[PDB]
C-alpha cells in the first residue's frame, strides 16, 4: 500500500 504520510 502507498504510505501518504511524511
Amino acid at each position, epitope marked *: *500500500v*502507498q*504510505i*501518504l*504520510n*511524511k
Partner: antibody
Framework: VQLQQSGAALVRPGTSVKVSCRAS????????IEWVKQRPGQGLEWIGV????????NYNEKFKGKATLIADKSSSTAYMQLSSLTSDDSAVYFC????????????WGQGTSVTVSS | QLVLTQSSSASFSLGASAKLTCTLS???????IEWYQQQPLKPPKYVME???????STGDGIPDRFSGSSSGADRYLSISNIQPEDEAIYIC?????????????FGGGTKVTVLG
C-alpha cells in the same frame, strides 16, 4: 501563500553553499518543505524533505551526505546546505510546500540559481 | 524501483484533444500521482492529484480543459482544445515510504509542442 528563496549564489568548487526558503502567509510547521533540483535539459530531481514539527528528514539516496536540510521554527525559514560543490551542482534549486497527508507539492519557491565556478 | 515512465516529447495540433501517459512501476500500479507543469524560467506549477480510479483534484489556476484518468498502472493528463499557453514540460510525481523513509520520485517529463 509564498515560499521566498534566497538570492543567486556563486560558490567555488570544493566549497559548500547554504540556501534559504522562508514561509510567508501560512503556518510553516503545519506543512513539510521539500527541495528539488532543476535537471539540465528537462525534469526535476528530488533532494529530500524536512518535517519542521519533527525535525525529521529523508533524502534521495544520491543526496545523502551531500544535502543537509534544517528548519528554524523561530524564523519560519527552511535551509539547505549542499557540500563539496562541483560544476554538476550548478543549477536552480526549488523549495516546495507539501501536506503531512498528501504527495502534492502545491506551492513552490521562485528558485535559487547556484553557479559553481573558479 | 518506484519509477514513473513518460515519453520525453509529445506533439498535438492546436484545438485538439491531448492525452499524456505517466506509467507507474507494476508493484506500484495502484498509487496516486501528481501532475506538474513547467514552462522555462518559472517554477513548476501543481496541476492535479490523480488516484487509481481516475478521481482527480486539480490545483489553483488550472483551467477546466485539464482533466485526469487512469487504467491499471497508467495515469493520464487530458487537455481538451490544446492552447499555445499549454506548451510546457508535464512531469508526474509519486510519494511513498520505502525502507521506512519517505521518497518522492519524478518522471522524466513530456515536452508538449502545440503544432499549427
Amino acid at each position: 501563500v509564498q515560499l521566498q528563496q534566497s538570492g543567486a549564489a556563486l560558490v567555488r568548487p570544493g566549497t559548500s553553499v547554504k540556501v534559504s526558503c522562508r514561509a510567508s502567509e501560512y503556518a510553516f510547521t503545519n506543512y513539510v518543505i521539500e527541495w528539488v533540483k532543476q535537471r539540465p535539459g528537462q525534469g526535476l530531481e528530488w533532494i529530500g524533505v524536512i518535517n519542521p514539527g519533527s525535525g525529521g528528514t529523508n533524502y534521495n539516496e544520491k543526496f545523502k551526505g551531500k544535502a543537509t536540510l534544517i528548519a528554524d521554527k523561530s524564523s519560519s525559514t527552511a535551509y539547505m546546505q549542499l557540500s563539496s560543490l562541483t560544476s554538476d551542482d550548478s543549477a536552480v534549486y526549488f523549495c516546495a510546500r507539501s501536506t503531512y497527508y498528501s504527495g502534492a507539492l502545491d506551492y513552490w519557491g521562485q528558485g535559487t540559481s547556484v553557479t559553481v565556478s573558479s | 524501483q518506484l519509477v514513473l515512465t513518460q515519453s520525453s516529447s509529445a506533439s498535438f495540433s492546436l484545438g485538439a484533444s491531448a492525452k499524456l501517459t505517466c506509467t507507474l512501476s507494476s508493484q506500484h500500479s495502484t498509487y496516486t500521482i501528481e501532475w506538474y507543469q513547467q514552462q522555462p524560467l518559472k517554477p513548476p506549477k501543481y496541476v492535479m492529484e490523480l488516484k487509481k480510479d481516475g478521481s482527480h483534484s486539480t490545483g489553483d489556476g488550472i483551467p477546466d480543459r485539464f482533466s485526469g484518468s487512469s487504467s491499471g498502472a497508467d495515469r493520464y493528463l487530458s487537455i481538451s482544445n490544446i492552447q499555445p499557453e499549454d506548451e510546457a514540460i508535464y512531469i508526474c510525481g509519486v510519494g511513498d515510504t520505502i525502507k521506512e523513509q519517505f521518497v518522492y520520485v519524478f518522471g522524466g517529463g513530456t515536452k508538449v509542442t502545440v503544432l499549427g
